[PDB]
Design a protein around this ligand. Structure first.
Ligand SMILES: CCCCCCCCCCOCCOCCOCCOCCOCCO
Ligand SMILES: CCCCCCCCCCOCCOCCOCCOCCOCCO
Ligand SMILES: [Ca+2]
Length: 150
């Protein structure tokens, strides 16, 4: 398992702070000299700075995250994408009226994985309810993350 910390900002320039735990799948596919497809289960706890709709709010999220990890030694570049689910502590977060507490989490990311198992990268994550509860404003977090094996 790996713990991660991430600081970021929303599309409305409010801060987000995320603490996470990750569990490597320990399965790979499409392995070639180029790299391999793999992934991890990702659990996230996020604090969202208040804005004009809510004071500060919290979300708990969980996602399978696919990773393509390119070949390397002390540094392996990677890209990632996943879809998960999130529950917010209210329906208004930052400047946004999400409509519902429950939301999907769609994410992409890229970074570097080091030989000691640590990694650093950027992530863009979006949360919305697919129109299932109006006004579904959605909200996003664009972040830098650091992860360390535990
Ligand atoms: C001030 O806090 C802001 C710090 O956040 C850094 C923003 O990081 C940039 C990430 O946004 C682009 C991510 O795109 C993902 C690429 O796959
Ligand atoms: C949802 C699960 C999110 C888990 C957060 C990980 C908590 O560990 C951080 C504690 O770090 C101590 C410093
Ligand atoms: Ca989606």
């Amino acid at each position: 398992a790996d713990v991660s910390a991430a600081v970021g900002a929303t599309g409305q320039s409010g801060m987000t702070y995320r603490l996470g735990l990750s569990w490597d799948w320990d399965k790979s596919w499409w392995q070639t000299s180029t790299g391999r497809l793999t992934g991890y289960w990702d659990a996230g706890y996020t604090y969202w700075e208040g804005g004009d709709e809510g004071a500060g709010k919290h979300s708990l999220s969980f996602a399978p995250v696919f990773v393509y990890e390119f070949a390397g030694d002390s540094i392996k570049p990677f890209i990632e994408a996943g879809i998960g689910v999130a529950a917010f502590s209210g329906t208004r977060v930052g400047d946004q009226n999400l409509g519902s507490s429950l939301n999907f989490e769609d994410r992409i990311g890229a970074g570097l994985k080091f030989a000691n198992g640590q990694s650093v990268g950027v992530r863009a994550i979006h949360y919305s309810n697919a129109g299932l509860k109006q006004p579904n404003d959605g909200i996003e977090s664009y972040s830098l993350f650091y992860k360390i094996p535990i």
